[PDB]
Amino acid sequence: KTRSSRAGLQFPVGRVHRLLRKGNYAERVGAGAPVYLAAVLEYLTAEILELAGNAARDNKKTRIIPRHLQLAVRNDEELNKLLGRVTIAQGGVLPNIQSVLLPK
Amino acid sequence: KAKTRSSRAGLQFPVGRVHRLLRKGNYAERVGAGAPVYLAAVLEYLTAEILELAGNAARDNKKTRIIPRHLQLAVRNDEELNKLLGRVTIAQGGVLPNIQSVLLPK
Amino acid sequence: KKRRKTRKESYAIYVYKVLKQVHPDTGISSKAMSIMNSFVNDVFERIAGEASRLAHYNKRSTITSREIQTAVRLLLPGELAKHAVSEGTKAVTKYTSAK
Amino acid sequence: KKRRKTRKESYAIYVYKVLKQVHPDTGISSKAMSIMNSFVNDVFERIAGEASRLAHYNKRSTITSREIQTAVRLLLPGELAKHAVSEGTKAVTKYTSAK
Amino acid sequence: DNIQGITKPAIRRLARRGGVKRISGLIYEETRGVLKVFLENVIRDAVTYTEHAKRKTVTAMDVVYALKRQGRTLYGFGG
Amino acid sequence: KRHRKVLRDNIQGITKPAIRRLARRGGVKRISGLIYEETRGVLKVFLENVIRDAVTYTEHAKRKTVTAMDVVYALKRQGRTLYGFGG
Amino acid sequence: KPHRYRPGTVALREIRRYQKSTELLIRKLPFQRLVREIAQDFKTDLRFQSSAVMALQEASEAYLVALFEDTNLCAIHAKRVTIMPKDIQLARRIRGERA
Amino acid sequence: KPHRYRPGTVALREIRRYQKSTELLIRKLPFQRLVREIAQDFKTDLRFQSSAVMALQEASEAYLVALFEDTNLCAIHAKRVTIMPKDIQLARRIRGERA
DNA sequence: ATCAATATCCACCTGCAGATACTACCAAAAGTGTATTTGGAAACTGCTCCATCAAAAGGCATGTTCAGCTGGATTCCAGCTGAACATGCCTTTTGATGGAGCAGTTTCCAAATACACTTTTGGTAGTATCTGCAGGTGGATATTGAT
DNA sequence: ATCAATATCCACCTGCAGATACTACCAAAAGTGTATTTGGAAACTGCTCCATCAAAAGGCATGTTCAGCTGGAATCCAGCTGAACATGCCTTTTGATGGAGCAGTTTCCAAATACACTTTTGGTAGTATCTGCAGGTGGATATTGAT
Ligand SMILES: [Cl-]
Ligand SMILES: [Cl-]
Ligand SMILES: [Cl-]
Ligand SMILES: [Cl-]
Ligand SMILES: [Cs+]
Ligand SMILES: [Cs+]
Ligand SMILES: [Cs+]
Ligand SMILES: [Cs+]
Ligand SMILES: [Cs+]
Ligand SMILES: [Cs+]
Ligand SMILES: [Cs+]
Ligand SMILES: [Cs+]
Ligand SMILES: [Cs+]
Ligand SMILES: [Cs+]
Ligand SMILES: [Cs+]
Ligand SMILES: [Cs+]
Ligand SMILES: [Mn+2]
Ligand SMILES: [Mn+2]
Ligand SMILES: [Mn+2]
Ligand SMILES: [Mn+2]
Ligand SMILES: [Mn+2]
Ligand SMILES: [Mn+2]
Ligand SMILES: [Mn+2]
Ligand SMILES: [Mn+2]
Ligand SMILES: [Mn+2]
Ligand SMILES: [Mn+2]
Ligand SMILES: [Mn+2]
Ligand SMILES: [Mn+2]
Ligand SMILES: [Mn+2]
């Protein structure tokens, strides 16, 4: 029986634990640390996949490409801050023209 | 204790301490013998460089004891040091005197 | 097997699981999967990093889930933080309630 | 007398030594010395941090002087970097050739 | 008062150190808003360090660490 | 039997139409004539900085090939973290 | 006539005066008040080391002064000498504080 | 007689076009030679994984586009619609790339 | 041009915060000597992928002509913002006193590490067959701009 | 408000790249089970420094007046810059090559950790003496702004 199932998770608790030792973040790693972290990662993954899938859907597509990931992130105030210094390859930008540039 | 590793390396900065600080740092599983020597040297040098300029700045202002203002003028007047400490704030440093020319009389 | 290329692990199968959970009929391009993978590693490091620092700041040689938690509060914005904390605590509680 | 002692070490004495070598008739305020201490700490952390990543990227469990060197190259402005490497190699030689 | 305690002449002094010659009437209100947001952002993080360390006092290190991670490193309080 | 023709003046390969296109994505409607030379300059600096670090990684690794991770680590440490190319 | 200085003459004199000094420019207590009130929103019954308050004041003033520089630069960009809210707003948006 | 769109109409058409797509806008090969030229001036006999060349271009266009936005914000600040070098310069000064 | 009102400057003086210097005391820190462990350089080489060349073709760059409309200049004045002066309200300072709580200390156990097997799994590899959509077409509708 | 040139739309289609499906294999990962070790929570508390007064002392902020001078509106025009056109080049794409260099493997030892034992030293604390320069003086002269 895995620790992931034991903690009710999709994300690998064993791996996360391993990578935490390997990474040299502290002398010791408590058993609850990789669990909590697998949890958070799985949650954020879920959040962005919900929103990206929606944008995929809004554009009549069934396969999420990076455009959708970008759309999802930049259209969401919080993920946009979390990734305010991250560039998503092949993402383009949000349609957006400044007002004074339109005619009348 | 025979000879301090700092004096073996010809340095004022504490090689031994720098070494200990590296291990407890959780920077790598291990630490070579040359590394604390090298780094201690590197900190020492940079320290000299700042005190040097900052010293000069004390002179310029008719003074013999360095205050923060002096370290601030030292750093901001030096292209490279200013880049290195470009996201750093020196407390009680004030700013360099600089007025934009279009604000100058007539 | 060609002098067996040493294994390159990623989060893909787990992202994929989670994907079927939220949008059961949606696929994901391998470039988009690549972004997702970078996404997860990036955030892993940021949280582990903050934790690493927290423990150090407090002369603690162990990173517990309490470090992971503050790390999450320090790093993520408002609502993502609240939910992340929530899902994390829950999952730990479940984990320890076993046995 | 060992109770409320909990040692608070700083680079301050070693800063002061270096001061006299370059400006033997120049002194330094408390606040100023404190800035200098923050300075050495900051730079220690930057260099050490970068040297750490370097080692991890290259799957190495040991931070050597080579890592400190590349770290410096990556971190210090050209000319400041050049002299730093020079000072660095020097002290590592002087040390090897010593007793 | 409070935020309103950060007075017009004080805001004027800062501006001056920043090289400013002529100041629009609306600046003082705008400025206070900005300063509020700065402090909120910093204090939150600082306090969160306080809570972690199980204390009821915000220490200078609490602030320093928070500044550092706001990308606003401060020298001279690392004692 | 071994080539490498001299590489020079390749900055001019950042053509005026390509720079215009970029300004468009950037939301720009009207472009002064002096922009193109200016933009070439700004890109040149950007590349130099990224490659310098990228190559420092390659070298430290005793390799002769600049890998995408090199560029990735280089980008990260300049606060231009990039997703999509590994790591 | 009694004696009056042209508008802008004293302002210049103040810029020159304040770029020369380093003393903090906000009254200490109104500031301490402000700090405490904001904090109370995050946790109640808080005490502040006095050095912690000073850190915060040092940091804010540095921040505001530097912001006024960029602000001044935006006003000059539009052929003015009078800083306006749109100038602060632009500077901040370009800093990534609003983007 | 021949039809003529008014000045600005194609520009807007183009902004819409490009904001809608994600493909790169600098021709691949010219870009590569630039990268290769610049790298060579740092070190000779270097080679490049093609993905490393692409990593650079994706990063570079991402940077330049974002810059133009800031620039466009500056021109509009000056009450213009035409971006000029002084706009790029103001932008880069505030970003802390210049001064 | 004058000349007056202020600011600003330099020399000198002196009190005192804060730096200096002496002495004692001690843990924790640093060196040194001995026993053992292993990270990762060297050597050899399998196998990926980078440089390079070839040849074909058309997408897109270059260069030009032309005039539309933007930027840049000039003028203008209404009003908002600086300067100054008069109050007086609260920040500052200070010296002094409880007492919150941070920090040092001893205790001890729940949880972490070490380790030895044992089982499970994700990654790759190979080979073979689906499926979302880019990009091509053609024809209907929407936007623009000249009257 | 009409008409016509052109962009834009969308529905339709089809190759096909990329995504997917199966089998097969296994080295590393992960779990399980003990033995052995200890990080830091807990609880008691001592003393540092924080909150709170009191209490002038006055400094500095606030309110008001008045007018200079700046911001922004309106007007003009020269020429820069966008749109369209013609021509054709060099990027792109498709495919094939040797071979440089990265990356996998096994060998093996210079240098690391791991402990212990001795010696040192940087920090703290207690007491005492010393001094760089802030802040106050006065008197020269420079700046600014009115004639
Ligand atoms: Cl834990
Ligand atoms: Cl070493
Ligand atoms: Cl405004
Ligand atoms: Cl310009
Ligand atoms: Cs790390
Ligand atoms: Cs946060
Ligand atoms: Cs550098
Ligand atoms: Cs004078
Ligand atoms: Cs005095
Ligand atoms: Cs051409
Ligand atoms: Cs033409
Ligand atoms: Cs249409
Ligand atoms: Cs097709
Ligand atoms: Cs206290
Ligand atoms: Cs051509
Ligand atoms: Cs071409
Ligand atoms: Mn060259
Ligand atoms: Mn080994
Ligand atoms: Mn004309
Ligand atoms: Mn105009
Ligand atoms: Mn008037
Ligand atoms: Mn108590
Ligand atoms: Mn499996
Ligand atoms: Mn299509
Ligand atoms: Mn213990
Ligand atoms: Mn004007
Ligand atoms: Mn070879
Ligand atoms: Mn001593
Ligand atoms: Mn003085």
CATH (domain of C79): 1.10.20.10
Domain residues for D88? 1-99
Spell out the residues 6+ positions from residue E28 whose beta carbon is closer than 8 angstroms to its own. E8, E11
Q: Resolution limit in angstroms?
A: 3.2
CB–CB contact D52 A23 (8 Å): no
Spell out the residues 6+ positions from residue C96 whose beta carbon is closer than 8 angstroms to its own. A32
C-alpha to C-alpha distance for B9 and B37, rounded to whole angstroms: 7
CATH 1.10.20.10 fits B1-106, yes or no: yes
DSSP C49: H
Specify the 3-state DSSP secondary structure of G49. coil
Spell out the residues 6+ positions from residue D47 whose beta carbon is closer than 8 angstroms to its own. B39, B42, D68, D71, D72, D75
Interface residue ranges in chain A relative to chain F, Cβ cutoff 8 Å: 66, 85-90, 92-93, 96-98, 101
Tokens describing residue A38:
């697998």
Torsion B68-H97-H55-G98 (CA) sign: positive
Cα G9 to Cα B80, E14, F13, G6, G14, distances in angstroms: 35, 18, 52, 6, 9
Hunting for tokens 């000064």 — which residue is that? Answer: H93
Domain F1-87: which topology? Histone, subunit A (1.10.20)
Measured in whole angstroms, the distance separating CA G68 from the mean position of its chain's CA atoms is 7
Cα G75 to Cα E64, G86, G91, distances in angstroms: 33, 9, 10
| Nearest residue for J5, CA–C1' | H3
Instruction: State the number of CA atoms in the 13 A half-sphere of D10 facing the CB.
Output: 17
Contact H68, F86 (CB under 8 A): no
Gap from C16 CA to J108 C1', Å: 45
Contact C76, C87 (CB under 8 A): no
Closest CA of chain A from B82, distance in Å: 23
C-alpha to C-alpha distance for H43 and G17, rounded to whole angstroms: 50
Domain A1-104: which topology? Histone, subunit A (1.10.20)
- Of D41, A28, F76, the residue nearest E76 (C-alpha): D41
Contacts of D90 in chain B (CB under 8 A): 10, 41
C-alpha to C-alpha distance for B76 and B97, rounded to whole angstroms: 11
**Angle between helices D12-22 and D30-57 in degrees, nearest 10:** 110
For residue H88, the tally of other CB atoms under 10 A from its CB is 24
Q: Is strand J within 7 Å of residue C58 (CB)?
A: no
Q: The domain G1-99 belongs to what CATH superfamily?
A: Histone, subunit A (1.10.20.10)
Instruction: State the number of CA atoms in the 13 A half-sphere of B103 facing the CB.
Output: 27
Specify the 3-state DSSP secondary structure of F78. coil
Hunting for tokens 């923060």 — which residue is that? Answer: B68
CB–CB contact B94 E18 (8 Å): no
**Composition of chain D by helix, strand, coil, percent to 5:** 70, 5, 25
In the 27-86 segment of chain B, residues within 7 Å (Cβ) of strand J are: 30-34, 58, 62-65, 67
Contact D3, E44 (CB under 8 A): no
Spell out the residues 6+ positions from residue H99 whose beta carbon is closer than 8 angstroms to its own. H93
User: Do the chains A and C touch each other, judged by at least 3 C-beta pairs below 8 angstroms?
Assistant: yes
Give distance in angstroms: CA of D10 to centre of ligand 28: 15
C-alpha to C-alpha distance for H2 and B92, rounded to whole angstroms: 69
Architecture of domain E1-79: Orthogonal Bundle (1.10)
Torsion A4-A9-A14-A15 (CA) sign: positive
C-alpha to C-alpha distance for A36 and C44, rounded to whole angstroms: 11
Q: Where are the domains of chain B?
A: 1-106
- Of A54, A85, A77, the residue nearest A67 (C-alpha): A54
Closest CA of chain B from A81, distance in Å: 20
| Nearest residue for J24, CA–C1' | C1
Q: How was this structure determined?
A: X-ray
How do beta strands C27-28 and A63-64 pair?
Answer: parallel
